[PDB]
Design a binder for this molecule. Structure first.
Ligand SMILES: CC(=O)N[C@H]1[C@H]([C@H](O)[C@H](O)CO)O[C@@](O)(C(=O)O)C[C@@H]1O
Length: 474
């Protein structure tokens, strides 16, 4: 008997453009993680001012200890404070946006990796010119601070003390070890004991310093099953190349390889843009990984690196080809050791890349599956076993637009090839980003974006379904 539970709203948006009960207009970008303890962690972007990809956005989660039946109160991981002097509040806050959750099965540490931008319009407000964000000194890497009127780079060193371009300590200090709830004090700039401003503010500044205007990657972790989180760690310098303009995560839930030469490796989907074509023709998927339980991260190569496009080779750092782009993605490892990267794209159908070396490089054959439509929106996919057989469950909008949620089932053969077996609707009406997780006992859960009755984009809801829903027809 087919079984699909009624939708349960986890993060409720307001309606008709009004704020919700907590004064928040929108929630977006779901992430669902089933931890070792059986806990379900639902993550999301808490977009207070509007539904756009910038503004005042906090990284939040809710925990369920009864497999999705009930949920605890919201837990904020990170939420930077707004620039109280910005002329336009809608774009007047440093930004955190798009999160990826994953747990190390050995250490049990839970990671939340997400984007960070200083005050502005996020990916839509990036400068045409690069600004160095870090400087190496005496074998040490320090984040840079810029002061109007001076060309030299100041640096943030031990204890947050600001040093002049010439290497002399100043009386300015940055809060590099935040202590306020949500770490809303991170980046605060002090002169002596007086708070002057914040290094993440870019307009109407009250302090002399700001970090480089660029795209960053931050990470927070929890060792207590999601109840409390560490202060944000800037992992950007570990993975961002000097040519990269944007570098952000493909939101959802990452994975840890289960088998092969790279078992234990944590994979985080991400994508970049270059300075040649940025968002018009350079969005390129890839993953970043960690082989030491999240201590250090490394960038793999882009699916587009040395890819053959129309008898011509391209590279993610120099490409300018709209149709060859691949953006947000979801990653899965097969029992044969191969890694599959399902990438959001502009071909109208499902695009999948394959890596034979734990996600570092990608094979030449980018497969397209007409069986699974892609309206250019995020998707999620997970590996699963059923009666000794290997499968992959993938969910995304069925179209025409971002609507009619579908859960696709594919059989995985020993060569890693896919055969799509079923396509079952799961949510009528508006449907966008989603995140799947296997719950066990033949059941699965999904946290997704949907709206109805005038709700603001989006309300994130949860549903559970079993194998009877996947295989049998409704
Ligand atoms: C960092 C960031 O802006 N992420 C956003 C991305 C990018 O804007 C696009 O991938 C750029 O092509 O996509 C969304 O806007 C979208 O399509 O709903 C949602 C997501 O939060």
């Amino acid at each position: 008997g087919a079984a699909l539970t009624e939708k349960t709203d986890i993060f409720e948006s307001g309606r008709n453009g009004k704020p919700n009960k907590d004064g928040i207009k929108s929630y977006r970008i779901p992430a669902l993680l089933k931890t070792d303890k059986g806990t379900l962690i639902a993550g999301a972007d808490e977009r207070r001012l509007h539904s756009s990809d910038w503004g005042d956005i906090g990284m939040v989660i809710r925990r369920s200890e009864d497999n999705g039946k009930t949920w605890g109160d919201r837990v904020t991981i990170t939420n930077l404070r707004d620039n109280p002097k910005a002329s336009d509040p809608s774009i007047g806050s440093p930004v955190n946006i798009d999160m990826v959750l994953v747990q190390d099965p050995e250490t049990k540490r839970i990671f939340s990796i997400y984007d960070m931008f200083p005050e502005g319009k996020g990916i839509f407000g990036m400068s045409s010119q690069k600004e160095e964000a870090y400087k190496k000194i005496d074998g040490k890497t320090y984040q840079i601070l810029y002061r109007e009127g001076e060309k030299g780079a100041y640096t943030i060193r031990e204890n947050g003390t600001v040093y002049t371009p010439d290497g002399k300590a100043t009386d300015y200090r940055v809060v590099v070890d935040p202590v306020k709830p949500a770490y809303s004090d991170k980046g605060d700039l002090y002169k002596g004991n007086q708070l002057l401003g914040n290094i993440y503010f870019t307009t109407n500044k009250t302090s002399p310093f700001r970090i480089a205007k660029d795209s960053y990657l931050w990470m927070s972790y929890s060792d207590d099953d999601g109840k409390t989180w560490s202060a944000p760690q800037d992992i950007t310098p570990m993975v961002k190349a000097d040519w990269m303009k944007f570098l952000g995560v493909g939101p959802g839930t990452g994975i840890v390889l289960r088998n092969g030469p790279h078992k234990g490796r944590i994979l985080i989907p991400v994508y970049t843009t270059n300075n040649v074509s940025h968002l018009n023709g350079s969005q390129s998927s890839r993953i970043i990984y960690s082989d030491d339980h999240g201590k250090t991260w490394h960038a793999g190569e882009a699916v587009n690196d040395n890819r053959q496009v129309d008898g011509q080779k391209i590279h993610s750092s120099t490409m300018n080809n709209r149709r060859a782009q691949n953006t947000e993605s979801t990653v899965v490892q097969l029992n044969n050791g191969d890694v599959k990267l399902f990438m959001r794209g502009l071909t109208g159908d499902l695009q999948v890349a394959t890596s034979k070396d734990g996600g570092v490089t990608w094979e030449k054959d980018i497969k397209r599956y007409p069986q699974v439509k892609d309206v250019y929106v995020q998707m999620s996919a997970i590996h699963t076993m059923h009666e000794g057989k290997e499968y992959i469950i993938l969910s995304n909008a069925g179209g025409p637009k971002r609507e009619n949620g579908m859960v696709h089932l594919a059989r995985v053969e020993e060569n890693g090839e896919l055969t799509w077996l079923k396509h079952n609707p799961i949510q009528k009406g508006e449907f966008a980003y989603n995140s799947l997780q296997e719950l066990g006992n033949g059941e699965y859960g999904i946290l997704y974006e949907h709206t109805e009755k005038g709700q603001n984009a989006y309300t994130l809801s949860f549903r559970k379904f079993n194998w009877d829903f996947l295989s049998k027809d409704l």
